[PDB]
Amino acid sequence: GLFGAIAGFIENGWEGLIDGWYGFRHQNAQGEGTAADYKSTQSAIDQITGKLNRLIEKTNQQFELIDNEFTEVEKQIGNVINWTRDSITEVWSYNAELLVAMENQHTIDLADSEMDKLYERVKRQLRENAEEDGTGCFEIFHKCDDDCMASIRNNTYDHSKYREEAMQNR
Amino acid sequence: GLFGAIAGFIENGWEGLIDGWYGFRHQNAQGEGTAADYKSTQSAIDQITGKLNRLIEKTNQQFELIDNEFTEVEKQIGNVINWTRDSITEVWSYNAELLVAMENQHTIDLADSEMDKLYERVKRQLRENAEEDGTGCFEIFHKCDDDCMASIRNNTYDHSKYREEAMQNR
Amino acid sequence: GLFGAIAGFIENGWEGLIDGWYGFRHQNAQGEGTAADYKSTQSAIDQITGKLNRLIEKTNQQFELIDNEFTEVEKQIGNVINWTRDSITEVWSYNAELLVAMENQHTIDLADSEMDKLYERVKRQLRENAEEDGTGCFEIFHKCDDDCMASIRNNTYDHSKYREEAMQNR
Amino acid sequence: DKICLGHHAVSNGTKVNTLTERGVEVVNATETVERTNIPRICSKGKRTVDLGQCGLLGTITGPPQCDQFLEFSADLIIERREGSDVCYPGKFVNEEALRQILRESGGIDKEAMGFTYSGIRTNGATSSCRRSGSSFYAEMKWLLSNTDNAAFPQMTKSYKNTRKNPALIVWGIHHSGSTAEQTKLYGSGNKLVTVGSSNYQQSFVPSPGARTQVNGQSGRIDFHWLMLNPNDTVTFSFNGAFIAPDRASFLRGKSMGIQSGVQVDADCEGDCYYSGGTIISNLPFQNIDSRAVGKCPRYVKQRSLLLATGMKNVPE
Amino acid sequence: DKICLGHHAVSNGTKVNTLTERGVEVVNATETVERTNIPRICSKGKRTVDLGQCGLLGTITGPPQCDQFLEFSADLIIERREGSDVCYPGKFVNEEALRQILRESGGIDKEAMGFTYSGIRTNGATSSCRRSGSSFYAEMKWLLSNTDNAAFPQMTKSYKNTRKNPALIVWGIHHSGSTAEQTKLYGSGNKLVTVGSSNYQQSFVPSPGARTQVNGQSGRIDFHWLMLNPNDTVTFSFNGAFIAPDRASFLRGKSMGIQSGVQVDADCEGDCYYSGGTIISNLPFQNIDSRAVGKCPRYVKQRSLLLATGMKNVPE
Amino acid sequence: DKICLGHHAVSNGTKVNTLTERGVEVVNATETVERTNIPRICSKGKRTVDLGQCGLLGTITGPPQCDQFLEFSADLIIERREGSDVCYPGKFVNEEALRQILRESGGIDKEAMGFTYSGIRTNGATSSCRRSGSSFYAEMKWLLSNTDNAAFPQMTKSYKNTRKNPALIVWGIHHSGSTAEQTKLYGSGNKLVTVGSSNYQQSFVPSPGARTQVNGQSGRIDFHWLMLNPNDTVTFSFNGAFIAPDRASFLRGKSMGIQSGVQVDADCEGDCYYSGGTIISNLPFQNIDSRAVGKCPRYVKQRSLLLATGMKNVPE
Ligand SMILES: CC(=O)N[C@@H]1[C@@H](O)[C@H](O[C@@H]2O[C@H](CO)[C@H](O)[C@H](O[C@]3(C(=O)O)C[C@H](O)[C@@H](NC(C)=O)[C@H]([C@H](O)[C@H](O)CO)O3)[C@H]2O)[C@@H](CO)O[C@H]1O
Ligand SMILES: CC(=O)N[C@@H]1[C@@H](O)[C@H](O[C@@H]2O[C@H](CO)[C@H](O)[C@H](O[C@]3(C(=O)O)C[C@H](O)[C@@H](NC(C)=O)[C@H]([C@H](O)[C@H](O)CO)O3)[C@H]2O)[C@@H](CO)O[C@H]1O
Ligand SMILES: CC(=O)N[C@@H]1[C@@H](O)[C@H](O[C@@H]2O[C@H](CO)[C@H](O)[C@H](O[C@]3(C(=O)O)C[C@H](O)[C@@H](NC(C)=O)[C@H]([C@H](O)[C@H](O)CO)O3)[C@H]2O)[C@@H](CO)O[C@H]1O
Ligand SMILES: *[C@@H]1O[C@H](CO)[C@@H](O)[C@H](O)[C@H]1NC(C)=O
Ligand SMILES: *[C@@H]1O[C@H](CO)[C@@H](O)[C@H](O)[C@H]1NC(C)=O
Ligand SMILES: *[C@@H]1O[C@H](CO)[C@@H](O)[C@H](O)[C@H]1NC(C)=O
Secondary structure, eight states: OTTSTBTTTBOSOBTTOOSOSEEEEEEOSSOEEEEEOHHHHHHHHHHHHHHHHHHSOOOOOOBOOSSOSSSOOOHHHHHHHHHHHHHHHHHHHHHHHHHHHHHHHHHHHHHHHHHHHHHHHHHHHHTTSEEEOSSSEEEESSOOOHHHHHHHHTTOOOSHHHHHHHHHOO | OTTSTBTTTBOSOBTTOOSOSEEEEEEOSSOEEEEEOHHHHHHHHHHHHHHHHHHSOOOOOOBOOSSOSSSOOOHHHHHHHHHHHHHHHHHHHHHHHHHHHHHHHHHHHHHHHHHHHHHHHHHHHHTTSEEEOSSSEEEESSOOOHHHHHHHHTTOOOSHHHHHHHHHOO | OTTSTBTTTBOSOBTTOOSOSEEEEEEOSSOEEEEEOHHHHHHHHHHHHHHHHHHSOOOOOOBOOSSOSSSOOOHHHHHHHHHHHHHHHHHHHHHHHHHHHHHHHHHHHHHHHHHHHHHHHHHHHHTTSEEEOSSSEEEESSOOOHHHHHHHHTTOOOSHHHHHHHHHOO | OEEEEEEBOOSSOEEEEOSSOEEEEESOEEEOEEOOOOSSEEOTTSOEEEOTTBOTTHHHHOOGGGGGGTTOBOSEEEEOTTOBSOSSSOOBTTHHHHHHHHHTSOBEEEEEOOOOOOSSBOOOOEEEEESSSEEOOSSEEEOBOSSTTOOOOOEEEEEEOOSSSOEEEEEEEEEOSSHHHHHHHHOSSOOOEEEEOSSOEEEEOOOOOOOOOBTTBSOEEEEEEEEEOTTOEEEEEESSSEEEESEEEEEOSOOEEEEOOSOEESSSOOSEEETTEEOOOOSSEEOSOTTOEESOOEEOSOSOOEEEOSOBOOOO | OEEEEEEBOOSSOEEEEOSSOEEEEESOEEEOEEOOOOSSEEOTTSOEEEOTTBOTTHHHHOOGGGGGGTTOBOSEEEEOTTOBSOSSSOOBTTHHHHHHHHHTSOBEEEEEOOOOOOSSBOOOOEEEEESSSEEOOSSEEEOBOSSTTOOOOOEEEEEEOOSSSOEEEEEEEEEOSSHHHHHHHHOSSOOOEEEEOSSOEEEEOOOOOOOOOBTTBSOEEEEEEEEEOTTOEEEEEESSSEEEESEEEEEOSOOEEEEOOSOEESSSOOSEEETTEEOOOOSSEEOSOTTOEESOOEEOSOSOOEEEOSOBOOOO | OEEEEEEBOOSSOEEEEOSSOEEEEESOEEEOEEOOOOSSEEOTTSOEEEOTTBOTTHHHHOOGGGGGGTTOBOSEEEEOTTOBSOSSSOOBTTHHHHHHHHHTSOBEEEEEOOOOOOSSBOOOOEEEEESSSEEOOSSEEEOBOSSTTOOOOOEEEEEEOOSSSOEEEEEEEEEOSSHHHHHHHHOSSOOOEEEEOSSOEEEEOOOOOOOOOBTTBSOEEEEEEEEEOTTOEEEEEESSSEEEESEEEEEOSOOEEEEOOSOEESSSOOSEEETTEEOOOOSSEEOSOTTOEESOOEEOSOSOOEEEOSOBOOOO
C-alpha cells in the first residue's frame, strides 16, 4: 500500500481482531484488552461496498444473433464477424484485467490510509501526554486505567487532566 | 478522500473563503482574520486544468457513412454493422463512465493532499512554538500579532525568536 | 506527486546519489557523508518491475487476414472492414494513452510515498532526541559520530542512550 | 502504559493482482468473472416457442414439421439442430438474412393472397411431404400443367398489401431432375418466372439437371423471398416451374431467437442465453460462451479475475 | 493565540461519481458528455453541394432532377430524402457501394466515350423523364430498333480509358413490361448484353414481364456499373434491351457525404455532422447521434457524466 | 549535528505524461510503443512456402506458375504481388473467400475424381498456358467437341467424397470471344452447366461475346467452387463450355497466410507478420502496420508513449 500503515510500522495484523477491521490494543495496570473501532471499520466497508454496487453493473443493451451454429454462414461474412468479435473480446479481456488490478490497488491503499488516519487521530488526542513507540503504539506517560483507555477509544479523553503529570515524566 | 484532510480533522470547509481554495484563519490579540494561500490554490488549479486540457481531446480520425438512412441496406450486412456499432458504443460508454469516476476519485484525493501538505508545512515552521489542536489549527504558545501571523502565512516566520518564550509556556 | 516528498519539503534531489534511489546525508564532527538505503531503493524498484512484467504482455490471440493488399475486396465489405478496424484502432490508441498516463501518475506518487515513509521511520527512531528542520533533515540535539549515524541508517540506533542529554539541550 | 493501533488479519488470505504486484494476499476477495451455468432455458415471464423438428424458415412455407407453427406467437423463439426448413429438398436464397428477421418478428400472422388458377392443375404433391401419404407445403401451391406435357398457359398474378406493416412474400422455383420430367410437368419450351414490385426487381429461370438423391428426389426447389411495402403490389409472371404461394406473412411484434440444445424451464427467470442454457449472474464478466445473446455480462478470455474486498493481509 | 488551516466550501455543491461513492458533493464540476445541437449544416470553409431533388447516383446517369449536377465539384456532399436516382423506374445493382464511392469522390468530371450507331434508332424517350415533354437520361442513349419489330443488328462497342485515374462506367438493361413491347422495340428473338474488360467479367439478359405501375411504367431499367482501369478497355456486345452510356465519369478529389434534413449554413464552421445538424463541441463524448460522421466526439449511452473540477464539499 | 533524507536525481531526465501534467520530467523512462522493423519474414520453426509467381488460388487449378505447388504442405503461406491464379484469362467467383480458406488450410492434398469421357475431345489447350508450347491447367480438362461444330453429347458426371474431411471441388465455365468460335468448339445451340449436391444448388450458362485481349485471348474462364461434404456426391450436367476438373482438393491441417514483399529468413524466429517483414517485440503496442497478422502488439495511432520507470526528477 501507498500509506505505510499495513505492512509498514504496524509490523503485522491481529488475527484476534474478529470484532471489526481496525481496533485498539492497550496494556495497563488492570492488564491488557483489545477492542475494535466501529467508525473506521464501517468507513472502509462502506467504500468497498461502494465499489461493489458500481461494479455489479447491468447493461440494458440487448445483443442478438448474427452467427448461426447449425448452418454456417457464408465464409467471407463469417470471417469478418469472427474477426470483429475476436477483436472486441480482446478489448473486454483487457478492460476487465485492468479494472480489477486497478481497483485492487486502490482498495489496498484505501484501507491502508484509513488505518493511518486513525493513528493520526489518536495522536492528536493525547497531544503531549504520550510518544510514538515506532510500531503503531503510543507510550502514555501517565497511568491509564481501563476507563482511561475507553475515554481514548470513544474519543472523550481529555489531555489537560493528565498534562501536568505526563509532562513531568519527561 | 485518501488523505484525511477534507472531511477529516478539518471538520468542515469555509464558505467565507472566496479569495482562493486554501487559506489561513487566525485568532489573536487584535482579533481574527482570514486570508487565502495563493501558492497552494494555484497548485490545485493547475492540476485540475491539466486534467481538462488532456480530456478536451480531438481525434483527427474521420469516420464516414457505412449505413444509409433513406434507403436501408441489405439485411445481413446491416445487422453486422448494427451489431458492430452497438458493441463499440458499449465500449466507449464503459470507458467514459470509468474515466470520469477515476479522475473524480483522483481529483478529490489530490486536493485533499494539497491541504494536508500545507498543514504539514506550517507545522515544520513553528517547530517547538506550537501544538496541534486536532482540528487543523495550531495553538501558538507565544503572542502572535497580525505581523506575526503574516510572517507565518508568507513563510518568513522565525521560530528561534519565540522559541525560549514558547517553550517556557510548557 | 501526491505525498509532498519529491518536489516538496526536500527542496530537490541529489545527483551524487548513484548508489541507490534513496539515501542519507549527515553532517557531524568528523565531517559529512552520503550513503544510500538499499531496502527502500529495492522496494521502489520491485514495484516498478512489477509494473513492467504485467505491461510486457503477450496475447495468445491470433488474428488473420480479412483484407487483401494485392487484389482489393468488394467495396461495401471493404468499407465495413476498414470502418471496424478504424474504430478499434481508436479504442487501443485511447487505452494505451490512458494506461501510460495513469501508471506514470502512479509511479511518481509511489516513489514519492516511499521517500516519505522512510522519513517517517527515522523520525520514529530518534523520538525525542531530534527535531524537524523542515527541509527533510533532523537536527540531532546530541553529538553523533559516524558510528552514531550508521546506527541510525542501519536501524539499530537506541534513543534512550542519548535521551537525557538530547532533552537537556532544550 | 501503552495503547496500540491495529488491523485484522487471517491465516489464510486469498491472492489477488494489482498494478504493482502479482499474487499479493488480501483478507477477502470476490469473483468477478462468471462460470456458473444453468443447463436449461429459463423462460419464466416469456411466451416461448420450441420449434423442435420445425425449421424457422419452414414456418413460412409450412412443411409437415411446421404445421404446428404456421402462425406462431412468441417472445422467445428457440431453434433446434434437428430443425428443417424443408420437406422437398431445396434451399432458401438469403436464408440467414430471413432467419435473422424471423427471430425478432414476435411471430407470424398469415393472410391469403387469393390467387385463382384456370386451365391448369394446382394440387401438386410429393412423397417427401408426408401427411396422409403424398402432399406438399401448406402455404404453397405446386402449379402443374393440366396433364402430362400440356403447355402451361402464360399467366400473371397480383397481390396488394393493404396493411400498415410490410408483407413477407415467399415463392419458389422448381428445378427438375431432368429435361424429360420438366416438360412432363410444365410442357416443352423454356420457362421464366419474373417477379416485380416497387422495391424488388429480378427474374428466375429453372435449371433442369440430375442431382444427388436427397430425400428420394433429384430435383430441388429454390425458395426466394422479398418484402412487400404497404400499398405496393407483387406481380408473378410465369409459365412453369413455379411454386406459387397461397398466403403472405406479417410480423406480429418483437421477439428474440436463440439456438440451444437444452430443455426449457418456465420456472426460472432469465435474460442471457446461449446454446448450453442460461447465464444468470450479477458479475460484470463471463467466460462461458462468447456468442451469448440477450442482456449479458461481457465475454472475457480469463477464467478468473479476483476483486479484493479486504485489506492487505499480514499474518501474525 | 491560534492559527487554522482550511479549505473553501459552498452551500450548493454539485453531485458527481467516484470509484468508491455515488453522488458525493464537490465544489465545482463540468459536463463531459455533449447534448447541444446546431440545427443546420455548418458549411463554412467547405464547398458544399445540396443535391435536394437529385439522388446521388443520379448524377452519373442524369435524370432531369440531376441536370443541375452532371459534373459537380464538392468538399461536402449532402443527400436529401426527396432525392431520386431515377426518372424511368429501376434500381442500381450494388447501389450502396457506388453511393459510398461517390460520397468521397470530391465530385465527378465526365468524358465522352464516343460511340457511333448505324442502322438503328438512338433517340429513345419516355414521359417519365420530363424536360420539354418526353425525354431520357442525359448521360445514356436508349438504343432502339430502327422501326417497330425490325431486327436489332448485333453490335459491339469499345472505350479505352487513357487517364491516370480509373473510369466509372455505367450502363443499363431495359426490362420491358411484356414480350409484346419487347419485340416492338428490339425485334423478336432472345437478347443478351455481355460486358468485358480486365477486372470485370459478367453478362446480362433482359426479363420481359408485367409489373406494378411505378411512374406510369410497367418496365424497369437495371443500372449496372464497373470500374475501368487505366489503359483498360470496356466492351459492350448487345442486340437489344441495352441502355448505352454516352459519357464515363471520373472522380475529382476528396469529399465527405452526409444525409441531413436541415438547412445549410456557410457562416458557422463545422466538422461533426449528423441528420439533425452539426455537433460543435470540445467535450470528449456525445449523446446526440450514434451515426454521426466526420471528426466527432465518441458516442456514449449516458446522458450526462460529470467531471469534478473542485474538491470534496463540506458545508459550514 | 544533522542527518538528511534524500532521493537521487539527474541533470538530464526524460519527459513523460500523467493524468495531471504534460511533459513532467522523470529519472528514467522506457518505450511502450514499438516501431522497430525486421525487413524479412522470420520463418524459423515453421515450414514455409513462398508462392512467388504462383497465385494462391492457382494451386487448385494448376496453371504453369503453380506446377511447383499442386500439393504443397505449409505452416506459413506467403503470397507475392507477382502471383497469378490464372494462365488463360478469368476470375474466381467468391475469390477472396476461397483465398481465406486456403491461407489456413495447412496445404492441399489432391485426389482423382476419375471421370471418363467418350465421344468427345478431352485434350484442349492454349498458347496462354505454356509448358512445352500450348497446354492447359494441370488439374482441369478442357472438354471439347470431337471435331469442329460437332454436337456435344449431353453428359453427366459424378463424384463421391469418402474421406472424413470435406472436399473442395472446382470447375470452370468457358466464355468464348464470339458465337462463331463457341459453336466451333461445342456445336451450335444453347449450353448449360448445372451443378448439384446436398449443400450446393445452382446453375451456369456461358456468355459468348467480344472482350479485351488479355493474354492474347478474347474469351474468359469463370472458375467456380463449392465444398463437398463427406458421403455427399457432386453432379455435373453439361453439353459444352465446361472446364471439367480431374482432381478434388483436401485441406491438410492448419496454417497462416500473409502477403509480403520481403525475403524469407529461416534463422530468425517470428510470430507477428506484415507486408514489410516481422515485428518481434515485447512492448504492448506497435505503430508499424495496422493490418499486421499473427500474435501481435495492439496497433495504436501514437508514435511514442513513454512509461516512467523512475521518480519525478528534481535537479540540483
Ligand atoms: C435412382 C435414381 O437416381 N432415380 C431418380 C429418382 O429418385 C426420381 O424418382 C422419384 O422417386 C421418388 C421416390 O423415391 C418419388 O416417387 C418421385 O415421384 C414424385 C414425388 O413424389 O416427388 C411423384 C409425384 O406425384 C410428383 N409430383 C408432381 C406434382 O409431379 C413428383 C414430381 O413430379 C417430381 O418429384 C418433381 O421433380 O415426383 C420420383 O420422381 C426421378 C425423378 O424424375 O429421377 C431419377 O433419376
Ligand atoms: C394500366 C396498365 O397496366 N397499362 C400498362 C401501361 O402503364 C404501359 O403504358 C405506358 O404508359 C405511359 C404513360 O402512363 C407511357 O405512355 C408509355 O409510353 C412510352 C413511355 O413514355 O415510356 C412511350 C415512349 O415513346 C416509349 N419509348 C420508347 C423508346 O419506346 C416508351 C417505351 O416504349 C416503354 O416505356 C418501354 O417499356 O413507352 C406507355 O408504355 C404499358 C407499356 O407497355 O403497359 C401496360 O400494361
Ligand atoms: C486481334 C483480335 O481481337 N483478335 C482476337 C484474337 O486475339 C483471338 O485469337 C486467339 O489468338 C491467340 C494468340 O494471340 C491464340 O492463337 C488463340 O488460339 C487458341 C488458343 O491458343 O487459345 C488456339 C487453341 O488451339 C484453342 N484451343 C481450343 C481447345 O480450342 C483456343 C481456343 O479455341 C480459344 O482460345 C477459346 O476462346 O484458341 C486464338 O483464338 C480470337 C479468338 O477467337 O478472337 C479475335 O477476336
Ligand atoms: C467462427 O468462429 C467459430 C468458433 O468461434 C467457428 O466454429 C466458425 O467456424 C467460425 N466461422 C468461420 C466462417 O470461420
Ligand atoms: C440498424 O439500426 C438502426 C437504428 O440504430 C435501425 O433503424 C435499422 O433498421 C437497423 N438496421 C437493421 C438492418 O436492422
Ligand atoms: C481500406 O483501407 C486501406 C488503407 O488502410 C485502403 O488502402 C483501402 O483502399 C481501403 N479499402 C476500401 C474499400 O476503402
